[PDB]
Amino acid sequence: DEAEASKFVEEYDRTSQVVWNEYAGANWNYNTNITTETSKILLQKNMQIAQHTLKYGTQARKFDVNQLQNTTIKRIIKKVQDLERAALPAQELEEYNKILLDMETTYSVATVCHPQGSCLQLEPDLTNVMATSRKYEDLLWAWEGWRDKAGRAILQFYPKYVELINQAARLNGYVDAGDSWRSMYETPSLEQDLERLFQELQPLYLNLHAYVRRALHRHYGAQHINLEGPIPAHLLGNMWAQTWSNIYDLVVPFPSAPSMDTTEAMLKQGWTPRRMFKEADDFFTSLGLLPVPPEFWQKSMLEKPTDGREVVCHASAWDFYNGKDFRIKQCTTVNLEDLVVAHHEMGHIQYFMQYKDLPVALREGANPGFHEAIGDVLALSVSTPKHLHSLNLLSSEGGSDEHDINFLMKMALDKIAFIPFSYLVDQWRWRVFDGSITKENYNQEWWSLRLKYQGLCPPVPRTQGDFDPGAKFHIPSSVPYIRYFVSFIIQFQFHEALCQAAGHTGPLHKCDIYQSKEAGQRLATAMKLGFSRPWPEAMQLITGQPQMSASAMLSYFKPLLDWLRTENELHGEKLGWPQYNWTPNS
Ligand SMILES: *[C@@H]1O[C@H](CO[C@@H]2O[C@@H](C)[C@@H](O)[C@@H](O)[C@@H]2O)[C@@H](O[C@@H]2O[C@H](CO)[C@@H](O[C@@H]3O[C@H](CO[C@H]4O[C@H](CO)[C@@H](O)[C@H](O)[C@@H]4O)[C@@H](O)[C@H](O[C@H]4O[C@H](CO)[C@@H](O)[C@H](O)[C@@H]4O)[C@@H]3O)[C@H](O)[C@H]2NC(C)=O)[C@H](O)[C@H]1NC(C)=O
Ligand SMILES: O=C(NCC(=O)N1[C@@H](c2cccc(O)c2)CC[C@H]1C(=O)O)[C@@H](S)Cc1ccc(O)cc1
Ligand SMILES: *[C@@H]1O[C@H](CO)[C@@H](O)[C@H](O)[C@H]1NC(C)=O
Ligand SMILES: [Cl-]
Numbered sequence: 001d002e003a004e005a006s007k008f009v010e011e012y013d014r015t016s017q018v019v020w021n022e023y024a025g026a027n028w029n030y031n032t033n034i035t036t037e038t039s040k041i042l043l044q045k046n047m048q049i050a051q052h053t054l055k056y057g058t059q060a061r062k063f064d065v066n067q068l069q070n071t072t073i074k075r076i077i078k079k080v081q082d083l084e085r086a087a088l089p090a091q092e093l094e095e096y097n098k099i100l101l102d103m104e105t106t107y108s109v110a111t112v113c114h115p116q117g118s119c120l121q122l123e124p125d126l127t128n129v130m131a132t133s134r135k136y137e138d139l140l141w142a143w144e145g146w147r148d149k150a151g152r153a154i155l156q157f158y159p160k161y162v163e164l165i166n167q168a169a170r171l172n173g174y175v176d177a178g179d180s181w182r183s184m185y186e187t188p189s190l191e192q193d194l195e196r197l198f199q200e201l202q203p204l205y206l207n208l209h210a211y212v213r214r215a216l217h218r219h220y221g222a223q224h225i226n227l228e229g230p231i232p233a234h235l236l237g238n239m240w241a242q243t244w245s246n247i248y249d250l251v252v253p254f255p256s257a258p259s260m261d262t263t264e265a266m267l268k269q270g271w272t273p274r275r276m277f278k279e280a281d282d283f284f285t286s287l288g289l290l291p292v293p294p295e296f297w298q299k300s301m302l303e304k305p306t307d308g309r310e311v312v313c314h315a316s317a318w319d320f321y322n323g324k325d326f327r328i329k330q331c332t333t334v335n336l337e338d339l340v341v342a343h344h345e346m347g348h349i350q351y352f353m354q355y356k357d358l359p360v361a362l363r364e365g366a367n368p369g370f371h372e373a374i375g376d377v378l379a380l381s382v383s384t385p386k387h388l389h390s391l392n393l394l395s396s397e398g399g400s401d402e403h404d405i406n407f408l409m410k411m412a413l414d415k416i417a418f419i420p421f422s423y424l425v426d427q428w429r430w431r432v433f434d435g436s437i438t439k440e441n442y443n444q445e446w447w448s449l450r451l452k453y454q455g456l457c458p459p460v461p462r463t464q465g466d467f468d469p470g471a472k473f474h475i476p477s478s479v480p481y482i483r484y485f486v487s488f489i490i491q492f493q494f495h496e497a498l499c500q501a502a503g504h505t506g507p508l509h510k511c512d513i514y515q516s517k518e519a520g521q522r523l524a525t526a527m528k529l530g531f532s533r534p535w536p537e538a539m540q541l542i543t544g545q546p547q548m549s550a551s552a553m554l555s556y557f558k559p560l561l562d563w564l565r566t567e568n569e570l571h572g573e574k575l576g577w578p579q580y581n582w583t584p585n586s
């Protein structure tokens with residue numbers, strides 16, 4: 001009996017490597033070359049991999065997992081019993097695959113056009129507008145235009161997507177798709193734990209929000225910013241107001257401590273997308289971690305194609321399930337923001353390489369947030385003024401309190417501002433999946449949460465037909481989002497532990513773990529576990545303790561919280577948005 005279970009997982013592993021490797025190649029080809037042909041082939045591979053999943057998932061369900069003794073085999077079989085979309089009847093499965101393909105293609109090819117003028121894509125064109133324009137009406141054009149063209153066009157698909165993804169989840173023993181997604185963390189207390197973490201970061205976020213709101217009031221005018229209300233959502237330098245670092249120039253704490261233009265520095269010094277990924281590779285290997293294989297450099301897509309091909313530009317990392325072939329797909333732009341993204345994606349590749357010898361059912365991160373956090377941890381060190389100066393992208397900014405607070409502010413605009421956004425995305429989707437939000441109030445409930453958690457308001461009142469969640473990649477692409485909230489909490493925990501491992505002393509935000517073999521060994525031992533053990537074990541290997549905790553992030557930003565409280569108190573800011581019902585008059 002035990003022996004039948006072992007043979008089963010051995011046969012599952014052999015056949016899954018072959019089938020998954022073939023699917024990965026067809027998915028890569030559509031993603032790097034959106035055409036009618038590659039679409040058709042992808043859909044055919046969907047059915048071939050569904051046939052495999054159904055064959056083996058049906059066998060796995062014949063095992064009473066309770067009677068199995070070996071915990072690793074127990075764990076693999078339990079996972080294989082979840083067929084995901086392959087549980088759907090053939091008709092519904094075909095419909096679901098086409099729905100996902102149609103949503104992804106619609107988002108990827110959407111454009112915003114001036115009347116008898118240029119037509120702009122999201123990347124790079126509209127993202128550049130949101131990042132650099134300081135004109136209220138030009139920002140509004142790009143903000144509304146993207147939602148009009150991308151979001152509104154996804155709405156026709158979303159109710160059917162929800163019905164089918166929930167149907168699949170119920171057929172695999174869950175109550176709805178959000179239940180299925182949350183179960184990937186294997187943490188019954190997940191919702192309460194995340195809410196406790198969110199509340200711990202409220203002092204920092206509320207003080208940052210009030211400080212930024214005052215600076216926007218200075219620039220965009222008292223008639224357009226309510227100092228006791230929510231912030232208009234198009235003024236934060238980013239299409240989704242999920243990171244605010246592009247308005248640093250408007251909110252710099254000490255303008256007498258100017259910082260070099262890092263984009264112009266990268267461009268003036270002939271940086272390229274390949275250089276950016278090569279620097280990321282060197283950081284990983286300085287820790288004693290693994291280099292990406294030569295094949296990686298020949299097969300990856302590290303910039304947008306010149307030949308006009310439609311592609312999925314959103315950055316992503318690809319495991320082809322043969323232990324040899326790993327790739328990144330990114331429409332890379334030469335700036336600091338994309339340098340961080342490059343490290344993010346290279347962290348995925350490192351995880352792939354570290355757990356490549358596990359059975360494929362266990363070739364995942366300890367939980368989804370762990371997978372998203374690895375590259376971000378290294379990027380925290382890359383972003384320090386000391387490291388950027390070593391790359392000739394900043395002048396020597398050391399030993400200045402003013403430069404110190406300026407750097408903490410730059411980091412806060414990315415890391416702290418993202419916390420409430422990363423929280424609310426799946427608060428919304430979980431309630432869509434469980435039926436608390438219907439298609440009659442998709443958009444109203446999205447903005448209720450944008451207000452409640454981020455303190456933002458739409459610059460233009462929304463109307464029937466709007467589907468603003470559809471204008472955010474992960475919604476039409478059906479990529480879970482709470483992983484990024486988890487990642488942003490634990491990456492600071494990891495940073496703090498690795499800095500301690502490296503012998504660093506003094507303020508956590510001054511730590512640079514470059515070349516620390518001790519830091520590397522912490523990360524490798526945990527990554528090698530893949531998904532073979534509950535994630536608290538990986539947390540323990542890295543940090544010396546088993547819990548998710550906001551204390552490290554709070555420690556990192558403590559000098560900024562002190563400065564923000566003093567600054568906001570001096571100006572008499574009312575934290576939060578008591579006038580929560582305010583929206584722009586013009
Ligand atoms: C419960 O079952 C677990 C799974 O058992 C395996 O899978 C099942 C389905 C059957 O096929 C069974 O025959 C398999 O063994 C089992 O966990 C396994 O435990 C063994 C030890 O008993 C581990 O063996 C170690 O393997 C690593 C390498 O494995 C991978 O990498 C190599 C290199 O690429 C590949 O060739 C392999 O195919 C794997 O992909 C070895 O490096 C390691 O040797 C090192 O450690 C030994 C001491 O153990 C030293 O003497 C050496 O010098 C090395 O330093 C081991 O040989 C195996 O990794 C592990 N698998 C998993 C997935 O965890 C578990 O033990 C069972 N539980 C109980 C209570 O029995
Ligand atoms: O995470 C992915 N890119 C990064 C990313 O999107 N973000 C993360 C970020 C952005 C920038 C810098 C960072 O340090 C991290 C967090 C926000 C969030 C955001 O931009 O909204 C791919 S790996 C996700 C995927 C895509 C397609 C798939 O088929 C499977 C997975
Ligand atoms: C894109 O896909 C089409 C159809 O499969 C194919 O003919 C063409 O060679 C592909 N182009 C690239 C650059 O891969
Ligand atoms: Cl929005």
Ligand SMILES: [Cl-]
Nearest residue numbers: 368480482483
């Ligand atoms: Cl997730």
Ligand SMILES: [Zn+2]
Nearest residue numbers: 344348371372
């Ligand atoms: Zn990622």
